[PDB]
């Protein structure tokens, strides 16, 4: 069973508290991208990692428990596979022209206004998106789409939020 195996692996990654903190996630991640030069990146910043953790921290413990880490990691490895697929010219990064395809592949159907904002927030000066930005962006996108659904009766298409909920949703992200 892979979960049992991953569970034994996770234990070596969490430690004392049995969860992966932002700092621990950052290190695990950067040690991994390092072992992969073909993946252009200047590493996952601590703030980016804090953001990924918060967004993944559904039970609000501050760190990533096994299930949250397993979910996150299963997404990263798969999104990482997609990343290499769309880095056509082996530039180590994803082209802006290739980015919409990479996203669609990840299963995301956003466009026009939405997409442009994404590029704007995660792309480089030329429209190219590197690994940590690509991964972090999808982790958040996944988290947000999912966060939206979980707040819908039968997807009336809209969610009503008060101030406390809004701050909770946006500040803890």
């Amino acid at each position: 069973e892979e979960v049992r195996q991953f569970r034994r692996l996770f234990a070596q990654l969490a430690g004392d508290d049995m969860e992966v903190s932002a700092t621990e996630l950052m290190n695990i991640l950067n040690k991994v991208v390092t072992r992969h030069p073909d993946l252009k990146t200047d590493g996952f910043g601590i703030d980016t990692c804090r953001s990924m953790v918060a967004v993944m921290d559904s039970d609000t413990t501050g760190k990533l428990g096994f299930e949250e880490f397993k979910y996150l990691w299963n997404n990263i490895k798969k999104w990482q596979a997609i990343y290499k697929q769309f880095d056509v010219d082996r530039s180590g990064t994803i082209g802006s022209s290739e980015l919409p395809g990479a996203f669609e592949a990840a299963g995301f159907h956003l466009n026009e206004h939405l997409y442009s904002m994404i590029i704007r927030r995660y792309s480089d000066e030329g429209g190219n998106m590197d690994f940590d930005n690509f991964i972090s962006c999808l982790v958040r996108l996944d988290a947000m789409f999912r966060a939206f659904k979980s707040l819908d009766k039968d997807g009336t298409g809209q969610i009503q939020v008060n101030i406390q909920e809004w701050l909770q949703l946006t500040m803890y992200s």
Partner: peptide, 11 residues
Amino acid sequence: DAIDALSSDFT
């Protein structure tokens, strides 16, 4: 060495 495990899981 838990890293290599993770390092291998993604292409």
